Amino acid sequence: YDPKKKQMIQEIVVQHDLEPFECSKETAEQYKHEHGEKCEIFEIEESGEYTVRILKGATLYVPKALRFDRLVAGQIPTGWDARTYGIPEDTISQVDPITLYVLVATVEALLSAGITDPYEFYKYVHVSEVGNCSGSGMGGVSALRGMFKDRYADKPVQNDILQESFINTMSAWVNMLLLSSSGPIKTPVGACATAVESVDIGIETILSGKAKVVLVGGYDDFQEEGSYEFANMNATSNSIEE
Amino acid sequence: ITLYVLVATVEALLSAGITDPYEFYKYVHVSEVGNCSGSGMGGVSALRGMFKDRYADKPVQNDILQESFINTMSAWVNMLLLSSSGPIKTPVGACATAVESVDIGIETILSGKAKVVLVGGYDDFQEEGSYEFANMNATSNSIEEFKHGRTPKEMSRPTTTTRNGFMEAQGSGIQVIMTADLALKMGVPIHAVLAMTATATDKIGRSVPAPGKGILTTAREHHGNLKYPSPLLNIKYRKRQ
Amino acid sequence: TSTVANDKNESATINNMMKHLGRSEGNPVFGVFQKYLTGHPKGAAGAWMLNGAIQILESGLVPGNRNADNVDKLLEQYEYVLYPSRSIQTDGIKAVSVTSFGFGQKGAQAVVVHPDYLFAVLDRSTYEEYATKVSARNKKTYRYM
Amino acid sequence: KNANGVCDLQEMTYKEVANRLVELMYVKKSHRWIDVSLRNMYGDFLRRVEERFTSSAGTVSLLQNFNQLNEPEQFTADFFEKFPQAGKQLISEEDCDYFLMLAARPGQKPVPFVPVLDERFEFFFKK
Amino acid sequence: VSSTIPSQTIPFLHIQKKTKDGWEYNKKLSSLYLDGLESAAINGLTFKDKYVLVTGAGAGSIGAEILQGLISGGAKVIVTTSRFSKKVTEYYQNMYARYGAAGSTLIVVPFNQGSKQDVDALVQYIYDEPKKGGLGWDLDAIIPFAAIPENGNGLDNIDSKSEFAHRIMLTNLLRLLGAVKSKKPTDTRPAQCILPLSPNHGTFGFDGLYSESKISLETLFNRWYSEDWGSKLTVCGAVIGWTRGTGLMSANNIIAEGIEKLGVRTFSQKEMAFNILGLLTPEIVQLCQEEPVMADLNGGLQFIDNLKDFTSKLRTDLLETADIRRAVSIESAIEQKVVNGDKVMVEPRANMKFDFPTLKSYDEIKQIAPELEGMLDLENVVVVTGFAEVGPWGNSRTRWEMEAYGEFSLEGAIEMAWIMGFIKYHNGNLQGKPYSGWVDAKTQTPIDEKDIKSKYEEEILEHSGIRLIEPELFNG
Amino acid sequence: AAIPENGNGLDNIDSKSEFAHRIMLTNLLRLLGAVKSKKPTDTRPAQCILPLSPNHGTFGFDGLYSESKISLETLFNRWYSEDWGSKLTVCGAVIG
Amino acid sequence: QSNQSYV
Amino acid sequence: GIQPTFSALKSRTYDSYWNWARQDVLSMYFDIIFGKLTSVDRETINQCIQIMNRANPTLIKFMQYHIDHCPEYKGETYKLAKRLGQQLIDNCKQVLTEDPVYKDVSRITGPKTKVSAKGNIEYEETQKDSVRKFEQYVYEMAQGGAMTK
């Protein structure tokens, strides 16, 4: 993501038939289904592949780049890796970067509390008494980008991207990798006051007797799309002006 | 989804007999009317705008992210109807959002932070969520169901031998919960009593969509030595105490 | 939700809940499966099932899963769960257990008791005054509606 | 005019509305109606009441002919003995609108009361 | 009851034996069958561990009644249908829910007996192991009652319908029996083929090839001895008599009583099903395994000389009487009309009383829960005071109506019409008239509240609930 | 008109057996019905000499031969029950 | 459900 | 018409008698306590025969709970439900190990054609006076008729 080269795609109606290009039967059939009279699909009997000709009046999306004026963000230090904290490669490839940040912050918070083994809670409290009331303002924005943009673009995206997109999925991964508790889980969304909301939920959870330990907090990630939207609402500072 | 929430909220207040939302403020402080409702995904249409239509350079409103937030529906409810300063706590259970919201609302009321809470849950159906659920094989395949001779009104069949995924839906559901004494002092129809409510996680795993028996802890009790009944379960003993 | 794992795990969870709490043998809870009719709206799910539970409390009527063509043979072992396929009008439902299971290990349960057992804790005068107020409010709400 | 006092139309029960119509359109002293058109208006309102409070088709109307309304007090008593819920339920908005339309039906003697304060208030007040 | 069979009289239901002269009533076999029927009536008849194939068992039919009897007795039945649909599958589901006994399993399959491929595929699916997608069953009985209704077809109009019907009734029937034989591995578990023979082979005429099919089914009795499938299939030909309510004789129900006036018996569907289920008793099963069993359940109609002419006589007499009295009544009514010259029903309306939950008296509340007085903190008791929803079935009220009852009341129908915009309320001048009521939003014409549930219920149900995704609701 | 079909039992009622049944029974009846339809008068009937068989499945493995032959016997009753008694007259010769 | 974990 | 229609994917298997037995038991129990059902009706006996056919120990416990906790003090219909369900429980217990049987207890009906004064032909299936059960049906079949001599 280069904010000085923010990629967009512009819709154009073609005033000329593009030269045929080769592709598989499935992709050619999909092209014909979309376009129809404005596409032409034909099998190369020699091989089996298909040639697709896009005709006049068809719709194309030609990429364009926009010089975006929000070039500055408060970013985790360059070279920060979940690997240096012992998070395995399979988890890194499965979960969202926000979830990696949550896992690191959770183990570091337990270590701040002196709990080297998360199962040490179960010597003192029932498994139903350790909860996770933390949350996010937006959640797995990278997974949402996958679902909404990369899948539209037909890029290779994991089939469980929506799972990583859910805001409570970070808490789910925390419980699935560290705690294994059956205590309360209550994921707030304050969009900004999320962590103080989470402290409120965790305190009332503890005082109601439903939990004796709660993992509270808040997490969020910076991405191109959130940056652009905050710019559109004029909520963030303009780096060019600054 | 916010439209669905607004309609469900006014209809819930009307079910509670509150034609004017400001009638709460005759009995409770503005800081005692809250909105603990939530969503699994929130404004998926606004997310589609942000992530797809803006990439495509289509004309999209500049505050689409606002509508995309999951607490925005609660914000619009407060901005258009309630104007309370009570607690606002937006859960995300992704499928248990409404029951988790009832849990948050009940603890909010019992802690004394609110006397009235708007609990519930909402979600919207869209192309992108449908496609993702299909990729995770959580929803039933309509082609396969037509091959099996199943109509749309019989595709959603819980507990049957041939259940093969859930039927995605859309909408909202809101409830107005409050203390019993407030309900009786206001003279509102008390439809039900929320005796109990709980949330739970399962265990170690590597499958988020996999359900588990974590909520079984709601039935937990000790049974080592039951030679005599516990006096506390006996009503008259507690009454004389 | 009409998914294999979810329905099996739910019937099991309810059965073990009642078995551990000492539910008397031959007293199964009737299972309502609203999603057959309303689909599964993710977060609005528990709200719809809670509204249905309140309505079941009020009417005494237990709806039936009209799409329950053949309850899975793996659900016979759960003796504490009955699976109606048709609405049964009972003489009164005292409590309802609304249980939801969501992605990320979001198990959740709620218990909805009939408001009669609330009104039983009031004295006569309080209840009569409340009833008069509710009648007046009901007429006002009827006009507004 | 309800038991509490003067009110709006919507704050009346159907029995209250019918009793008020008989009070203001039927003369106790002479045992007669002010006008047969007003008797027909009372009949049409009672038609609306029975239609509102009956849900089954193929039911015989209590009022077969409006000539039964020439002695309307006992007929009103029988009608609202058959429909006890009518004397408990406030008049719906549908039936309030219907009542206001019957109060201004053309070819009928203008009603001897004012039902609403609206743009038609001059009409109701002066005709 | 065998001893109570009168001397020299042939019972209405009787088993026939084969002799040099042909098929004739047999006292011994009829005694055995009647005693089995008596035992079935008193103690009941069981069909446990009995695998049955049933064809043509549509709703309101003899096959359906045998299906009820089979699943009641405990049989595992494959019912095949040619009109597979939600309504058919729900009829069969309700049948199993009300009658399916312990161990009984009802398998509804789509099936065209008029195609060879369906016959072969069905027998393959029944006999294939579960690991190959089949059932792994060995049929203990076959009841191929699949008949297509053909009428008005004489010798001069043996049309495509008649040829297809003959295929279903005879050719593919025999192919189904042969396929079952081919897929039977053992010689110790025969299948009892209950053949729906008819006693009227062209006696009525204008039935297409029905008589040809039914009389061609009678060759299986001889072919049982002459071919190598005697130990695999056992023939039980039930000559079915006058059955009431069935399409084949529904036009003759009115003359059924006149037929019975002669000391003859006409059967209802339940009676005929009982008779045919009597052919599945263990005794008759053994008898079929020994020799082919012809059961004549005709009720003595073979003794009427010129049955067609007599039935026509009865129908003509009844119709003449009806026409005479119709003409007399019509003329009398016209006379009263011309002589004396030429009740108001109240039309129901919806009453949407948005009622709160009914409050009981304090005494009745204290009767439900006496010990709870002044025990709980009302400040600490949380209660649901109002609720609502937006969903596939409208609001809480209408969603509850469709959940609890499966249909909308008048109030619910109007609420759905208002939600989906089918109706709008109008209060003012409506095309030059003052109207206050519901108005069709599309046409802007008045509509009656009672008529709302008739004009719009179909569209409400079509465009509400779980249904095909509508692009107009999701932006194309 | 008969085609020779042999070795076909109940388990092998094949295309040959179905075609044979068509010839022997279905199109036979259609031929008789066509002759009736084209007969203008009721005073010159046609005597249909039906080749009936005495062995209806007594030998077996003959395909649908017995079915066709026994189905031809319905014409004897259908002569009375239908409106072609005066146009066609049935003479079933059970050939030995 | 130990016998010594409660008292 | 020769179009194939069979598919193994359209097979619908029904075998959950275990659930339908409890469903029907409860459905008839509430009919009894709400006054929609009485023992004299032969539909009651027909339903009880199916419940006996589907009898299982779990179903015995299911019925026994609802007949032991039946609040007989709330009306005659609850007393009726208690006593009648107790008899049905005894029957299900005695036939618990027995093989399910098909027993039709419907009232035997015969044709009845009547011509109204308006000349309308009405067919009604009336209950036969002399034949009430299938036992008497079988007796009638054994006797035959005058024309069967």
Q: Got the DSSP string for G1-7?
A: --SSS--
CA distances from E40 to D101, E43, E63, E277, F65 (A): 71, 6, 19, 9, 40
B163 vs D21: CA distance, rounded Å: 62
C-beta separation of A63 from A29 below 8 A: no
Measured CA to CA, the distance from residue B14 to residue C56 in angstroms comes to: 20
- Cβ(B76)–Cβ(B5) under 8 Å? yes
Contact status, residue A169 vs residue A140, Cβ threshold 8 Å: yes
List the single residue in B with minimal CA-CA distance to E419. B7
Residue E386 at interface with chain B, using a CB cutoff of 8 Å: yes
Q: Does C143 touch chain D (CB under 8 A)?
A: yes
Q: Which two tokens stand for residue D25?
A: 């359109």
Cβ-Cβ contacts under 8 Å, B155 against chain C: 2
Looking at the complex, does the CB of residue C139 fall below 8 Å from at least one CB of chain D? Answer: yes
Check CB contact of H57 with chain C, cutoff 8 Å. Answer: no
Please name the residues between 65 and 94 in chain E that touch chain C, using a CB distance below 8 Å. 89-90, 93
Which CA distances in Å does F86 have to B70, E200, F32, H78? 88, 22, 13, 74
Amino acid letter, residue E321: T
Residue corresponding to tokens 């802007």: E444
8 A C-beta contact, residue C63 and residue C52: yes
Q: E265 to each of C42, D101, E1, E257, E261, how far by Cα in Å? A: 62, 67, 18, 9, 9
Residue whose entry in the numeric block shows the structure tokens 């297409």: E208
Residue with tokens 């249905």: C52
DSSP class of residue B81? I
Rounded CA-CA distance D81/E47 in Å is: 60
d(CA H26, CA B208): 39
Quick check: B164 contacting E, CB < 8 Å? no
Residue F10 to residue E177, Cβ atoms within 8 A = yes
Phi, psi (degrees; rounded to nearest 5) at A224: -50, -45
Contact present, E197 and E298 (Cβ < 8 Å): no
Measured between alpha carbons, how far is D49 from D86 in angstroms, rounded to an integer?
8
Q: Which residues of B are known to be catalytic? A: 95
Q: What is the strand order of the sheet E14-19 is part of?
A: E22-25, E14-19, E293-297, E233-240, E191-197, E141-144, E51-55, E76-81, E105-110, H12-14
From the list E202, E226, E228, which residue is nearest F81 (CB)? E202
Q: Identify whether the C-beta of residue A229 lies closer than 8 Å to the C-beta of residue A147.
A: no
CB contact under 8 Å between B225 and G6, yes or no, is yes
First-to-final CA distance of chain H: 46
In chain C, residues with a C-beta closer than 8 Å to the C-beta of H30 are 88-91
Of E249, E219, E250, E274, nearest to E12 (Cα)? E274
Task: Name chain B's partners: 3 or more CB pairs within 8 A.
Answer: A, C, E, G, H
Nearest to A185 by CA among C100, C12, B44: C100
H or E stretch covering E421: none
Contact residues for B20 (Cβ-Cβ < 8 A; gap 6+) = none
- Cα of first residue to Cα of last residue in chain G, in angstroms, is 12
**To the nearest whole angstrom, how far is the Cα of B136 from the nearest Cα of chain A?**
6
Residue D90 in contact with partner chain C when CB distance is under 8 A: yes
Question: In terms of Cα–Cα distance, which of E416, B176, E408, D89 is closest to C141?
Answer: D89
Q: Helix E269-278 to helix E62-73 angle, to the nearest 10 degrees?
A: 50
DSSP H22: H
User: In this structure, are residues C38 and H79 in contact, taking their beta carbons and an 8 Å threshold?
Assistant: no
CA angle B85, B87, B88 (to 5 degrees): 100
Distance, CA of H48 to CA of H107 (rounded, Å): 16
DSSP state of E357: P
Residue with tokens 């990798």: A177
Question: How far is B51 from B65, CA to CA, in rounded Å?
Answer: 10
Query: In E135-161, which positions are buried (b, 16+ CB within 10 angstroms) versus exposed (e)?
Result: bebbbbbbbbbbbbebeebbbbebeeb
Distances, alpha carbon F25 to alpha carbons E102, F51, F59, F69, H1, in Å: 47, 11, 20, 7, 21
Distance CA B204, CA F69 (A): 77
Q: Which two tokens stand for residue E27?
A: 């006292």
Contact B65, A159 (CB under 8 A): no
Q: Are E165 and F7 in contact (CB under 8 A)?
A: no
A 10 A CB-CB count for E263 gives 16
Angle B164-B165-B168 from CA coordinates, rounded to 5°: 145
Rounded to an integer, what distance in angstroms lies between the CA atom of residue E210 and that of residue E158? Answer: 11
Q: Which residues contact F62 (CB under 8 A, 6 or more apart)?
A: F5, F6, F8
Q: How many CB atoms lie within 10 A of CB B43?
A: 24
Listed residue (F22, F23, F32) closest to F90, CA to CA: F32
- d(Cα E74, Cα E140) in Å, to the nearest integer? 13
Rounded to 5 degrees, φ, ψ at E157 are: -135, 50
C102 Cα to chain A: minimum distance (Å): 10
Give the CATH number for residue D20: 1.20.930.70
Residue A236 neighbours by CB distance under 10 Å: 17
Q: Do residues E452 and E418 lie in contact, with contact meaning Cβ atoms separated by under 8 Å? A: no
One-letter amino acid at B144 equals E
In chain E, % helix, strand, coil (3-state, to 5) comes to 45, 20, 35
Residue E53 contacts residue E141 (beta carbons within 8 Å): yes
Query: For the residues of B87-153, what is the DSSP string, one character each?
Result: -B--B--TTSHHHHHHHHHHHHHHTTS-SEEEEEEEE---HHHHHHHHHTT-BPPHHHHHHTT--GG
Mutate to test the interface with E, among D51, D96, D105, D120 (most CBs of E within 10 A): D51
Supply the range of the domain harboring residue D11.
Answer: 1-116
Q: What are the phi and psi torsion angles at C82 (to 5°)?
A: -105, 150
Does H30 contact C71 at a Cβ distance shorter than 8 Å? no
* Angle at CA of residue B124, ends B120 and B130, nearest 5°: 135
First to last CA, chain E: 74
CB contact under 8 A, C39 and E466: yes
Distances (CA, A) of E468 to B146, B153, C33, E398, E458: 12, 10, 21, 21, 16
Cα–Cα distance, A87 to A103 (Å, whole number): 8
- Residue E472: burial class (beta carbons within 10 Å; 0-12, 13-18, 19+): exposed
Determination technique used? cryo-EM
Tokens of E267: 């059967």
β-pairing verdict for C88-89 and C61-62: antiparallel
C-beta atoms of H113 and E6 within 8 A: no
Biggest CA-to-CA distance, chain A? 75
Token pair for A203: 């305190």
